[PDB]
Amino acid sequence: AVALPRVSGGHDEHGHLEEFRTDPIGLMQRVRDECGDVGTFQLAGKQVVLLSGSHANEFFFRAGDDDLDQAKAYPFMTPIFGEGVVFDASPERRKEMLHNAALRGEQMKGHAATIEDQVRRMIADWGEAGEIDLLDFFAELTIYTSSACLIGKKFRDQLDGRFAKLYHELERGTDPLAYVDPYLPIESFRRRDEARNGLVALVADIMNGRIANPPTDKSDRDMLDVLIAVKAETGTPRFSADEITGMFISMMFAGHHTSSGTASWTLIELMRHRDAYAAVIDELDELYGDGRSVSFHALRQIPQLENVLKETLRLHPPLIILMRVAKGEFEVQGHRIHEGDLVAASPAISNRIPEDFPDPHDFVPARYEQPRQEDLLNRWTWIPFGAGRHRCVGAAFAIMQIKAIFSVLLREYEFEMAQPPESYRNDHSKMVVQLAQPACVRYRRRT
Ligand code: HEM
Numbered sequence: 427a428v429a430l431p432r433v434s435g436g437h438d439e440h441g442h443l444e445e446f447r448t449d450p451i452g453l454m455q456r457v458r459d460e461c462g463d464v465g466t467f468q469l470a471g472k473q474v475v476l477l478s479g480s481h482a483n484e485f486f487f488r489a490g491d492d493d494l495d496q497a498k499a500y501p502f503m504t505p506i507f508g509e510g511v512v513f514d515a516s517p518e519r520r521k522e523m524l525h526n527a528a529l530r531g532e533q534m535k536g537h538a539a540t541i542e543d544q545v546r547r548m549i550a551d552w553g554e555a556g557e558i559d560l561l562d563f564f565a566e567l568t569i570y571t572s573s574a575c576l577i578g579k580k581f582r583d584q585l586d587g588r589f590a591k592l593y594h595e596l597e598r599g600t601d602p603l604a605y606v607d608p609y610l611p612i613e614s615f616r617r618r619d620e621a622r623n624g625l626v627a628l629v630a631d632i633m634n635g636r637i638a639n640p641p642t643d644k645s646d647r648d649m650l651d652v653l654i655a656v657k658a659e660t661g662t663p664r665f666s667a668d669e670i671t672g673m674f675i676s677m678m679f680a681g682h683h684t685s686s687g688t689a690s691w692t693l694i695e696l697m698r699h700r701d702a703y704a705a706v707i708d709e710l711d712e713l714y715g716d717g718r719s720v721s722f723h724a725l726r727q728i729p730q731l732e733n734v735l736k737e738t739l740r741l742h743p744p745l746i747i748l749m750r751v752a753k754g755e756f757e758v759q760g761h762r763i764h765e766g767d768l769v770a771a772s773p774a775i776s777n778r779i780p781e782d783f784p785d786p787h788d789f790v791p792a793r794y795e796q797p798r799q800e801d802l803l804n805r806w807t808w809i810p811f812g813a814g815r816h817r818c819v820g821a822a823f824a825i826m827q828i829k830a831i832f833s834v835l836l837r838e839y840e841f842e843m844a845q846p847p848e849s850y851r852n853d854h855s856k857m858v859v860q861l862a863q864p865a866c867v868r869y870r871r872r873t
């Protein structure tokens with residue numbers, strides 16, 4: 427059996443795993459530099475076939491589910507999701523876990539208004555001036571937007587900062603060792619299980635409260651009210667607090683850390699490039715000069731802000747690696763992929779291929795304007811949202827959310843970096859990328 431190209435290093439206890447934890451991007455870049463479109467690296471006991479370049483990526487995203495499986499490519503997601511969603515009906519995968527029902531187009535306008543309200547509640551006590559930490563702020567804000575939009579305003583209204591803190595701990599229990607076993611006796615895996623337990627308790631607390639004093643309107647009952655009333659065969663409540671919480675956690679995940687970090691970086695890039703920031707301000711002031719609401723404009727064109735978003739997403743994709751499990755043997759550029767092999771594509775690396783994106787390390791929102799339109803011409807390499815079969819179905823909502831949040835923030839306050847521009851960075855120590863702290867920013871009301 428012929429060996430596939432293998433990148434240098436990887437002599438630590440778990441091969442390349444250790445380096446993947448400290449510098450996954452640098453590692454993946456060295457794979458392409460040394461190996462080309464098809465290279466590999468060892469992740470503990472599993473070999474990862476990393477595909478880069480337009481041709482290999484295409485094969486990767488167009489592959490059928492019968493060929494490249496996404497189902498077991500993220501073992502680190504198993505302990506978070508927990509016992510399969512509340513409804514046992516075949517693969518609820520993305521169907522229920524991330525039902526497009528939530529992001530349905532009929533409710534889109536509604537969501538924008540919900541998002542507007544969440545931002546205002548979040549900056550309600552800002553006053554004329556002060557400071558914030560982007561991770562704390564955006565991580566909390568997105569817990570509110572995701573819960574209010576994906577579950578119900580009623581439910582969100584009963585949440586506070588504690589839910590965000592614990593949910594964060596949940597997200598941090600995704601160390602790469604999860605590819606060895608997501609249940610190893612790791613400290614972060616223990617803190618993860620303890621966090622999930624804390625979440626179940628907060629929900630159980632809410633369930634009780636709602637049972638002691640139900641709604642004075644059989645109209646204002648949310649999803650939780652419904653699940654609480656579901657009775658088993660003998661009259662007993664059918665769902666426990668753990669079951670309900672596990673489903674709520676599963677649904678919110680999709681609307682949390684990817685939006686959270688993306689909101690943080692969008693602002694960061696705006697501050698780093700005051701000219702783009704100035705263009706966005708002008709555009710928003712002029713655009714909202716028609717008197718229409720944020721729920722109106724978030725669902726419509728805001729070009730400058732959108733190109734700043736697309737560029738933020740190219741340089742800082744939330745998911746730096748995408749995974750699949752090969753369910754058969756395939757040939758890609760003369761290299762053989764075997765059943766069981768882990769197959770990956772990297773938005774982090776692909777989004778910066780020099781030949782596809784002139785000056786890949788520069789912030790150039792113009793890339794997406796009339797001329798170049800580099801996102802649409804590099805359909806297999808511009809991949810912040812993935813591509814093909816598993817293309818992010820929440821893209822439209824994610825973008826609407828960014829338009830909504832910044833339509834409120836940039837028109838009410840001005841932002842300045844409170845630390846060196848280069849000090850802002852991501853923590854890539856976990857499979858779930860998070861913005862690193864400190865990430866301090868100053869604000870002052872606009873005149
Ligand atoms: C700007 C923030 C977001 C980014 C960068 C992002 C990125 C991505 C990426 C790269 C994938 C591909 C995963 C893979 O190929 O294995 C994906 C998939 C997905 N995303 Fe997002 N996403 C974002 C927001 C959202 C939101 C807000 C939702 C809905 C709550 C959502 C729902 C989904 C779903 C359901 C999939 C699975 C698609 C499939 O497997 O067919 N995403 N996303």
Ligand SMILES: OC(Cn1cncn1)(Cn1cncn1)c1ccc(F)cc1F
Pocket residue numbers: 500503520523524679680681684745747818820857858
């Ligand atoms: O793709 C994710 C899972 N994931 C893989 N690597 C890191 N996180 C995240 N995500 C992507 N967009 C939004 N959330 C996902 C996909 C579908 C889903 F229903 C939940 C879920 F967490």
